[PDB]
């Protein structure tokens, strides 16, 4: 007769076993009659046996720097076979935790990139990218690009089509992200693209025009950066929205006590760059809005229009600035992703 054969997904005596996959045992020419797995302290590991008795797998994630011992017995008409296997899992030098935006279940605008931010510098960007699975429906091509040593972004060539579902699975637990840095955990988030909302601030008219699904719905007189502190041209992604916010220049790098510093409370403020540009209520400049530029870079509008903007724009909507005397918003600003040409974005910078 034929003696049962056992096949494990680990080898006895292995070291550095990664914990990004379950551990399995398979029987052939027989069935699994006993399968147990314990850690170094004797703590059992939860598992599940298939109804046909041929396949057993762990059902909870295994830990770092552990020693596991697997005992399996297979029985068949032709005899019995028993094996004992002991293996050692990865021993990270450090862990890093990923943080994903936008939030799970959110509806966002057509400019919203997927963002994965780690709390440590990532030595092996390629490994991180390979560990992140992005599903889109309808499917569209996209690509990864790193804004700095810790945050990676994914987006398509053109703005998203409304109604697209986007699923983000960051499967970094057990993955070596370089230099002994392993993922602290997995994260899973899902979001959806809503209406197309694109607002254009044209320096030639000093008007901020809001288009919803292609139709002009609001035309807002604005005052942008004066010549000495101009507003940069380019594509801005709407970020966070505030009924009011204490605008403190030191958050954007400039001491309040410096000549260009400031600390003032502002109403109805919508963030459009990490450098600190907002659409906001500006009662002090209503006389100049629609005529001349008087601000330090923000888009000043009236209180009523700033509240309208707050109420009708969402994270990931788009503000485009054109014809100013400024330069172009940096692509790595944090909300300036779309100013990177697609060929450069697509090629990436994983190194
Ligand atoms: Se931008 C902005 C938006 C609302 C209120 C104030 C500002 C601002 O930057 N003010 C400022 C900049 C530099 C020096 C003084 C004041
Ligand atoms: N983001
Ligand atoms: N992907």
Residue numbers in the entry: 57 to 407
Q: What's the paper's own text on this?
A:
Structural studies on LdtMt2 with potent inhibitor ebselen reveal opening of the benzisoselenazolone ring by a nucleophilic cysteine, forming a complex involving extensive hydrophobic interactions with a substrate-binding loop. LdtMt2 crystals were soaked with ebselen, and the structure of the complex was solved by molecular replacement (ESI†). In both protein chains in the ASU, electron density consistent with the presence of a single ebselen-derived adduct was observed extending from Cys354. While a single ebselen conformation was refined in chain B (conformation II), two different conformations were refined in chain A (conformations I and II). The ratio of conformations I and II in chain A appeared to depend on the length of time that LdtMt2 crystals were soaked with ebselen, with the conformation corresponding to that observed in chain B (i.e., conformation II) predominating at longer time points (data not shown). Extensive hydrophobic interactions are apparent between both aromatic rings of ebselen and the LdtMt2 active site in conformations I and II. In addition to Val333, Phe334 and His352, residues from the mobile active-site loop (a two-stranded β-sheet encompassing residues 300–323) including Met303, Tyr308, Tyr318, and Thr320, contribute to the hydrophobic pocket around Cys354. Apparent pi-stacking between the phenol ring of Tyr318 and the ebselen-derived phenyl ring proximal to Cys354 (ring A in Fig. 2A) is present in conformations I and II; this interaction has also been observed in the complex derived from LdtMt2 and 5,5′-dithiobis-(2-nitrobenzoic acid). The position of the ebselen-derived phenyl ring distal to Cys354 (ring B) depends on the conformation of ebselen; in conformation I, ring B appears to pi-stack with His352, while in conformation II, it interacts primarily with Val333.
